[PDB]
């Protein structure tokens, strides 16, 4: 478990100064700290930190990675490759745990929702509708963290089973404020919190499709 | 339809922002009417009062000793080019010790603990002609079209 | 059809001749620390305005 923190400064002149409208500067500065803490938690979950020996979810050495042909190749949609690879990933999760775990959640890049909206030829209902009809009981969502997975434009898709006994995030201490410590003519307020990152108990229930 | 959620990260620093709260030392002074001073640029003292010690400061000049770095404060104006500065006549806050974000125009990230070289204009430069005592703190980032560097200031 | 297509507001006195609105911004960061710590990163804010006639 690790601890997080920052601080902010404010002066009596700025406190006394008034404005036409809007939230006060103290409130805005206090909200900025909470936003920064939440963003740091997300960044620890999705990116890791080498010096602190925190392993990200894309760099875990015990999960299954699948190389994929590109779904979009120079504005040329391939709506069958996506379905084939998704079915392959689901079957891999099914057959790697010997039937004790079934895939339930898919996360895809937000820019690839156009591939799954194509009408299948010589019919009405789309590829996504056919996939849902054949695999009723699964949830598909979009995450912007998947647009880039290694800093160079590499995309990916994540298929997993959401279950507390398989993986979870701990936040033992919530975000809080400490009393200001006055100086000559200004103040100072520190902020602290705690977190742990992401831990996986069964790394055989997660599949990452890279290169998409 | 498939729901989507987006993500975006805030900027790290602003020109003249105090880096952290590790034993800083800021004092007030008066700017002489000759020329304005941009935040994040070093200043020099031209004349000090004898009764107490109040100082008059202006922009850096060739072959002169720097004194501090201008920092963001309530007293601050905006020039024609939307860049924030300190007006010719008024109070200025100058930091003489601690970690601060400072304007720069170099191209390669500096190494930890090496000496800091300034330019004629008072902005950090990797091959400047002005020698200083300050050090690099490691922080290297870019505001929108602006380069910034983290400088540790020792009292002169 | 202009008045029916776009929304209409009435928040000005008839004697008024200019108006303005303001937008703000924020910065900051966070780190991982220990119990005995004397330095922490800082945050700030900004502001902007526009005009009319």
């Amino acid at each position: 478990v690790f601890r997080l923190g920052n601080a902010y400064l404010i002066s009596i002149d700025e406190i006394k100064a008034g404005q036409a409208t809007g939230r006060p500067l103290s409130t805005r500065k206090a909200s900025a700290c909470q936003l920064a803490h939440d963003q740091l938690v997300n960044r620890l979950v999705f990116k890791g930190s080498a010096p602190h020996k925190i392993v990200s979810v894309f760099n875990h050495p015990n999960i299954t990675k699948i190389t994929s042909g590109k779904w979009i190749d120079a504005s040329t949609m391939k709506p069958e490759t996506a379905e084939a690879e998704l079915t392959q990933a689901i079957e891999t999760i099914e057959t790697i745990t010997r039937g004790q775990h079934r895939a339930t959640n898919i996360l895809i890049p937000p820019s690839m929702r156009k591939v799954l909206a194509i009408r299948m030829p010589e019919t009405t209902m789309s590829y996504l509708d056919y996939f849902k009809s054949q695999n009723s009981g699964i949830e598909i969502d979009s995450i912007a963290e998947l647009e880039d997975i290694d800093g160079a434009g590499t995309k990916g898709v994540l298929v997993y089973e959401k279950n507390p006994m398989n993986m979870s995030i701990e936040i033992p201490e919530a975000f809080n404020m400490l009393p200001a410590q006055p100086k000559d003519l200004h103040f100072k307020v520190p902020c602290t919190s705690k977190c742990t990152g992401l831990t996986i108990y069964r790394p055989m229930t997660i599949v990452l499709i890279t290169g998409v | 339809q498939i729901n989507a959620s987006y993500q975006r990260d805030m900027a790290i620093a602003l020109p003249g922002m105090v880096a952290d709260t590790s034993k800083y030392n800021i004092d007030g002074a008066c700017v002489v009417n000759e020329g304005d001073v941009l935040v994040g640029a070093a200043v020099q003292v031209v004349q000090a009062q004898a009764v107490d010690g109040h100082k008059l400061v202006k922009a850096l000049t060739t072959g002169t000793t720097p004194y501090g770095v201008a920092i963001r404060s309530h007293w601050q104006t905006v020039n024609a080019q939307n860049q924030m500065i300190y007006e010719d006549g008024g109070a200025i806050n100058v930091m003489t010790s601690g970690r601060v974000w400072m304007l720069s125009k170099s191209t390669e990230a500096p190494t930890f603990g090496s000496a800091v070289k300034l330019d004629v204009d008072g902005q950090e430069k990797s091959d400047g002609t002005i020698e200083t005592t300050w050090t690099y703190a490691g922080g290297w980032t870019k505001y929108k079209d602006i380069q910034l560097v983290e400088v540790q200031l020792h009292q002169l | 059809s202009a008045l029916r297509v776009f929304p209409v507001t009435t928040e000005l006195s008839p004697t008024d001749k200019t108006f303005e609105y303001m937008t703000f911004d924020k910065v900051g960061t966070a780190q991982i620390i220990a119990d005995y710590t004397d330095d922490l990163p800082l945050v700030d804010a900004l502001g902007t305005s526009e005009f009319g006639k």
């Binding site: 036409a20 409208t21 809007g22 936003l35 939440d38 963003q39 997300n42 999705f46 912007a144 963290e145 | 959620s5 987006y6 993500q7 975006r8 990260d9 805030m10 | 928040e11 000005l12 006195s13 004697t15 008024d16 001749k17 200019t18 108006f19 303005e20 609105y21 303001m22 937008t23 703000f24 911004d25 924020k26």
Partner: peptide, 17 residues
């Protein structure tokens, strides 16, 4: 004294995650 200020201000939004 002929110049009003809009009652609503716009905040640039930073999504969390």
């Amino acid at each position: 004294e002929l110049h009003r200020i809009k009652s609503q201000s716009y905040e640039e939004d930073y999504p969390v995650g």
